[PDB]
Amino acid sequence: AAPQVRTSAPGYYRMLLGDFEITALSDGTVALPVDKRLNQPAPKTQSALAKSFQKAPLETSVTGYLVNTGSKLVLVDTGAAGLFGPTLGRLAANLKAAGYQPEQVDEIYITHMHPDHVGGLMVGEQLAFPNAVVRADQKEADFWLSQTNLDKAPDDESKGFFKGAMASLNPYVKAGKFKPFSGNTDLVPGIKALASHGHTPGHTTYVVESQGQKLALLGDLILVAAVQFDDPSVTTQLDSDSKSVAVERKKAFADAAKGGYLIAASHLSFPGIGHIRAEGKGYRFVPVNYSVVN
Amino acid sequence: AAPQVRTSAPGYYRMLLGDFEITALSDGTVALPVDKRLNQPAPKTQSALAKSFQKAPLETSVTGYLVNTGSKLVLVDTGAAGLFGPTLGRLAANLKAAGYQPEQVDEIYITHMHPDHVGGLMVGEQLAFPNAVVRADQKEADFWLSQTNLDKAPDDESKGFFKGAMASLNPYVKAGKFKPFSGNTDLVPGIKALASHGHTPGHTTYVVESQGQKLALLGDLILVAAVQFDDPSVTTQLDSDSKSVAVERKKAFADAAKGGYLIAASHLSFPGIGHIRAEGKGYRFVPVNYSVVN
Numbered sequence: 001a002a003p004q005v006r007t008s009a010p011g012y013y014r015m016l017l018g019d020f021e022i023t024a025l026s027d028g029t030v031a032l033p034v035d036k037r038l039n040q041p042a043p044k045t046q047s048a049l050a051k052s053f054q055k056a057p058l059e060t061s062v063t064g065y066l067v068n069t070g071s072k073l074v075l076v077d078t079g080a081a082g083l084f085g086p087t088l089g090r091l092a093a094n095l096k097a098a099g100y101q102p103e104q105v106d107e108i109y110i111t112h113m114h115p116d117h118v119g120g121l122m123v124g125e126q127l128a129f130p131n132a133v134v135r136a137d138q139k140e141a142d143f144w145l146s147q148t149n150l151d152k153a154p155d156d157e158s159k160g161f162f163k164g165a166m167a168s169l170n171p172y173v174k175a176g177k178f179k180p181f182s183g184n185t186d187l188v189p190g191i192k193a194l195a196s197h198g199h200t201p202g203h204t205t206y207v208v209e210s211q212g213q214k215l216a217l218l219g220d221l222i223l224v225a226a227v228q229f230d231d232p233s234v235t236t237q238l239d240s241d242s243k244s245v246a247v248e249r250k251k252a253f254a255d256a257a258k259g260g261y262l263i264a265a266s267h268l269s270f271p272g273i274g275h276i277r278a279e280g281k282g283y284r285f286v287p288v289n290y291s292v293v294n
Numbered sequence: 295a296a297p298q299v300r301t302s303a304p305g306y307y308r309m310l311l312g313d314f315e316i317t318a319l320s321d322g323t324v325a326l327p328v329d330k331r332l333n334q335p336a337p338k339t340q341s342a343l344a345k346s347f348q349k350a351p352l353e354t355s356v357t358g359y360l361v362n363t364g365s366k367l368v369l370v371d372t373g374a375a376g377l378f379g380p381t382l383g384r385l386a387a388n389l390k391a392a393g394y395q396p397e398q399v400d401e402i403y404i405t406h407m408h409p410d411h412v413g414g415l416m417v418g419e420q421l422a423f424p425n426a427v428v429r430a431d432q433k434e435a436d437f438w439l440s441q442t443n444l445d446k447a448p449d450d451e452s453k454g455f456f457k458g459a460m461a462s463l464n465p466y467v468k469a470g471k472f473k474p475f476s477g478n479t480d481l482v483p484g485i486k487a488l489a490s491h492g493h494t495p496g497h498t499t500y501v502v503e504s505q506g507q508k509l510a511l512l513g514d515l516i517l518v519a520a521v522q523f524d525d526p527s528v529t530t531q532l533d534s535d536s537k538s539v540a541v542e543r544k545k546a547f548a549d550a551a552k553g554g555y556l557i558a559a560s561h562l563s564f565p566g567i568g569h570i571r572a573e574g575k576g577y578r579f580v581p582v583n584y585s586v587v588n
């Protein structure tokens with residue numbers, strides 16, 4: 001016999017993409033009230049959930065993706081650190097267990113500035129990635145880092161999002177390490193930002209490609225696998241432009257389905273990487289087959 | 295920047311079931327000439343794999359399952375040790391990565407005696423699990439351990455399967471550590487052996503259950519997910535009784551669909567755990583949702 005260990009495996013998943021090395025890094029999981037946030041009848045998501053063997057508050061993974069192009073070490077999204085509950089902020093640890101040091105990261109690309117994507121930028125009041133530049137969309141930054149917008153926040157108190165994006169990015173801004181880009185942009189060789197606005201004013205997709213092998217890093221372009229693959233147009237109360245999100249999601253899915261390449265998203269079951277094919281009304285997400293990397 | 299690490303994470307997946315702890319143990323992966331194995335025209339198989347973004351030779355998982363019942367630590371299947379080439383035999387290492395020691399395993403349940411399941415019983419010339427009692431269906435033992443049956447398989451190195459089983463289980467028989475059962479039989483509390491003969495004469499399913507949460511360990515009841523879930527009728531050349539495997543697979547699938555409980559299988563993409571639901575003609579496998587245990 002033995003005492004139960006009750007600990008999950010290190011939160012990182014290795015995958016080769018052409019000549020690049022991808023490592024999904026889990027920040028952990030948090031239970032979310034799916035029913036209340038979806039723009040569709042409560043009974044409808046409760047049914048979608050049940051068909052996916054999902055329960056009331058969905059335990060959702062929060063993920064970031066490390067890309068090592070063999071020339072640059074780039075991290076896509078950084079998790080929440082301590083901005084979104086006691087159950088997140090595991091990225092830094094997983095990055096190290098993944099075999100890397102925060103100091104080795106050259107660049108950080110932000111899909112959007114929500115707490116669960118920018119919190120990891122800071123370890124206390126010190127840059128968590130001291131030797132990297134932070135890249136995000138200009139519209140994204142002009143929205144969250146806006147003093148005006150903060151003091152102009154609706155459901156006040158819960159405007160810690162503005163405070164949140166600020167404490168996470170300003171330190172790099174003042175260190176002269178924030179380099180915003182505008183929409184579709186060539187970044188480091190092998191990676192490109194594609195403007196997939198809607199979830200937020202400057203939400204960005206990061207397309208990774210090596211040797212004809214592509215991986216579109218979707219950010220929060222999709223939030224609930226149980227309903228948004230089958231019905232791509234269903235949005236949430238968390239999206240800025242519902243119709244923009246819908247249009248961009250359908251474009252992303254159509255394209256990846258047409259091209260047969262990989263996609264990943266911050267909240268699909270960790271590692272959250274897979275292919276996507278057409279299926280009647282919408283799409284069928286196909287998780288990557290398990291594969292050993294030596 | 296930094297050199298690419300290129301190593302997969304430890305191959306162990308934690309999951310709680312009632313008061314039990316389940317740890318899927320990856321023994322590695324092996325490529326399988328799947329289109330040659332399935333008993334249907336090659337083009338058909340190849341088309342099914344494609345719809346799932348796959349191609350043969352197909353990287354296929356080989357998994358074993360550790361169950362800590364609190365009072366007992368049992369291992370269901372053990373991987374191949376060396377019997378199948380250098381890409382396997384990692385179950386031992388992964389068990390330790392999982393925070394357990396081979397010497398702590400109390401019992402070992404074998405779904406069947408193919409090499410990729412009993413190989414890990416031995417480490418070199420030594421018992422890998424020195425303090426464990428091994429269990430299997432007597433029909434399985436009578437068949438694989440029969441010097442006669444070996445001397446009746448003209449198929450040069452098919453006798454290997456017979457030798458594999460023998461070399462793998464006789465050290466335990468010789469030590470009085472082998473205890474067969476016949477047909478359905480309650481093993482330690484929380485775990486039942488249910489006959490599922492077909493793949494091999496005594497192929498057995500192990501059902502674990504705690505606090506109403508059920509997990510059926512199906513062994514090799516399914517080999518190619520991209521084919522056999524949509525078509526439970528397709529068999530393979532390694533199946534002893536074709537009709538029987540089909541029947542037992544359908545019974546398992548129909549049962550997990552109506553019960554809505556979890557099922558696990560040695561060759562479903564690591565960790566190979568999920569639920570099953572009927573979809574038109576046949577079934578659809580829904581892999582467990584990533585979950586953090588603390």
Ligand SMILES: [K+]
Pocket residue numbers: 101102103
């Ligand atoms: K360090």
Ligand SMILES: [K+]
Pocket residue numbers: 137138139140182183195201202
């Ligand atoms: K923009």
Ligand SMILES: [K+]
Pocket residue numbers: 107187188
């Ligand atoms: K750059």
Ligand SMILES: [K+]
Pocket residue numbers: 312313504505
């Ligand atoms: K119990």
Ligand code: NA
Pocket residue numbers: 133179
């Ligand atoms: Na730059």
Ligand code: NA
Pocket residue numbers: 209210211212
């Ligand atoms: Na290219």
Ligand code: NA
Pocket residue numbers: 395396397
């Ligand atoms: Na030991």
Ligand code: NA
Pocket residue numbers: 480
């Ligand atoms: Na019983």
Ligand code: NA
Pocket residue numbers: 433491495
């Ligand atoms: Na029988």
Ligand SMILES: [Zn+2]
Pocket residue numbers: 112114199220
């Ligand atoms: Zn978001």
Ligand SMILES: [Zn+2]
Pocket residue numbers: 114116117220266267
């Ligand atoms: Zn998010």
Ligand SMILES: [Zn+2]
Pocket residue numbers: 408410411514560561
């Ligand atoms: Zn097998």
